[PDB]
């Protein structure tokens, strides 16, 4: 009842089985590579039924050294990962193998990494602010507790530093458990996160799953499912509040695109897989809070070539309750976090949820920034000296506002040696209310740059010779 490899095309393997023993879709098959340096056991995942008892499978490990005709065995079940309280404090790969302690977790209960999302009748919308202490996030894009937050950004604009910032701000003072999913990112970043969580004592509450850049596309597109399976066990089987950090989900999409190319599928727009929205939706709909069971998920989303129109982030947008878009233009200004206040959004930034004062201040800030953006065209050529008096006043106010939205982050100290700051939501609302009213028009712009609340503004303005 064993199969045999008939075709090998990179990470994709075609296996012929005896009639009547064709494995089911997503079944995990096993093959052997015997060549010395590359000797290993390949785990393949049945992806297609090609007909004539052939199945096309995706290899989780590289296929180098695989020979046609070697026998392929069927496990009878899909890939499964260990679940339970024992996965906390340990590092796993996409297949559930423990890296910090090989052999650990083999005795745990094992859950298939493929399952349907929660039934529609179990879904209840989440509208509850999750305060972070970041002025821009709390004011303009409030995060939802038990909801879905995404961090969109191009290369090097600060997605990972902001993920570390949110781990610091949210995960440390967190009652429940955390799951981190390194999806196709730097391995040394995973090592740094592991060490930092160990130092901060958060590791004992966290399960880390890593399929990083130096992996075949199958692993890079299944590691997210493995981490989500652990998070789902924590949500469903223990009623724990779960923190889910994914970095980076675009890597899951990109791995899917590579696999689709290897599977002989017809390319879609921009060369992406035809089932881009389908795969993205399956994965994302599994990531959710159900009635009485909370998953606060935060995902970094890489944006190729800084093109926010790319199909991958464009499809990702729909699955989110809060979206923090990081801009190259803001980053170039030295503003951290490099949040684009106009492009970013939150589903709970409405008067009914955050209150009339918070909403009013946020809307006024957005209006001022939008007017500044509109004036950019004139300003680029002629400076601010050709604008009306109202426009000059508004532009100075907008510059101060956009500098004040920046902040000295907790996770930025390693870069600057400057300890981070946390601003209460009420202080943030009051400060931006005053700033929109023009009460700080006399202070120099730099006084607003990379500081905390109003007290820090006063101290910095004093240091610069200005008086508040």
């Amino acid at each position: 009842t064993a199969g045999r490899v008939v075709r090998i095309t990179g990470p994709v393997v075609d296996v012929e089985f005896p009639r009547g023993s064709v494995p089911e879709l997503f079944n995990a098959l096993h093959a052997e590579i015997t060549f010395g340096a590359l000797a290993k056991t390949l785990t393949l995942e049945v992806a297609q039924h090609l007909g004539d008892s052939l199945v096309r499978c995706i290899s989780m490990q590289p296929t180098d050294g695989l020979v046609r005709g070697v026998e392929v065995t069927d496990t009878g079940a899909s890939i499964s990962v260990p679940v339970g309280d024992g996965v906390k404090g340990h590092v796993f790969n996409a297949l559930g193998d423990c890296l910090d302690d090989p052999g650990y977790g083999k005795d745990f209960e094992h859950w298939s990494i493929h399952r349907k999302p929660p039934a529609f009748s179990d879904l209840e919308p989440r509208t509850e602010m999750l305060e972070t202490g970041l002025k821009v996030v709390d004011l303009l894009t409030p995060y939802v507790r038990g909801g879905k937050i995404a961090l969109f950004g191009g290369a090097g604009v600060g997605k990972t530093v902001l993920i570390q910032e949110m781990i610091n701000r949210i995960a440390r003072n967190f009652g429940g458990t955390s799951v981190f999913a390194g999806v196709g990112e730097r391995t040394r970043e995973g090592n740094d996160l592991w060490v930092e969580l160990a130092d901060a004592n958060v590791l004992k509450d966290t399960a880390l799953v890593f399929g990083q850049m130096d992996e075949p596309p199958g692993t890079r597109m299944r590691v997210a499912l493995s981490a989500l399976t652990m998070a789902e066990f924590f949500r469903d089987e223990q009623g724990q509040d779960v923190l889910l950090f994914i970095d980076n989900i675009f890597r899951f999409t990109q791995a899917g695109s590579e696999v689709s190319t290897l599977l002989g599928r017809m390319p879609s727009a921009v060369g992406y897989q035809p089932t881009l929205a389908d795969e993205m939706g399956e994965l994302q709909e599994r990531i959710t809070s159900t009635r009485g069971r909370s998953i606060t998920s935060m995902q970094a989303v890489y944006v190729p070539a800084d093109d926010y129109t790319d199909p991958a982030p464009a499809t990702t947008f729909a699955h989110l309750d809060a979206t923090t878009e990081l801009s190259r233009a803001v980053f170039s200004k030295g503003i951290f976090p490099a949040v684009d206040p106009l492009a970013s959004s939150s589903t709970i930034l409405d008067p009914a949820i955050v209150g009339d004062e918070h909403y009013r201040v946020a809307q006024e800030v957005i209006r001022i920034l939008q007017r500044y953006k509109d004036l950019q065209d004139i300003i680029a050529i002629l400076g601010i000296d050709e604008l009306s008096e109202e426009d000059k006043q508004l532009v100075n106010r907008a510059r101060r506002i956009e500098r004040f939205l920046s902040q000295n982050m907790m996770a930025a100290e390693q870069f600057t040696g400057q300890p981070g700051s946390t601003v209460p939501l009420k202080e943030t609302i009051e400060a931006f209310d005053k700033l929109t009213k023009g009460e700080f028009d006399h202070l120099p712009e730099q006084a607003f740059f990379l500081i905390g609340g109003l007290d820090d503004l006063a101290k910095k303005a004093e240091s610069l010779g200005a008086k508040l």
Binding site: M266, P267, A380, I381, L382, G383, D385
Partner: protein, 48 residues
């Protein structure tokens, strides 16, 4: 004197703007050619 300085500055700003816009336009032109060829060859391969 200040008008001369300001108009020199504005002319240089317009130079920089024209350069950046021309670079963006050339990038868009190349991308359009590449995408047109992508669609044409995708259709041709589908037909084959």
């Amino acid at each position: 004197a200040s008008r001369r300085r300001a108009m020199k500055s504005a002319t240089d700003n317009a130079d920089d703007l024209i350069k950046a816009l021309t670079l963006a336009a050339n990038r868009e032109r190349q991308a359009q050619i590449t995408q047109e060829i992508s669609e044409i060859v995708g259709g041709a391969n589908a037909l084959a």
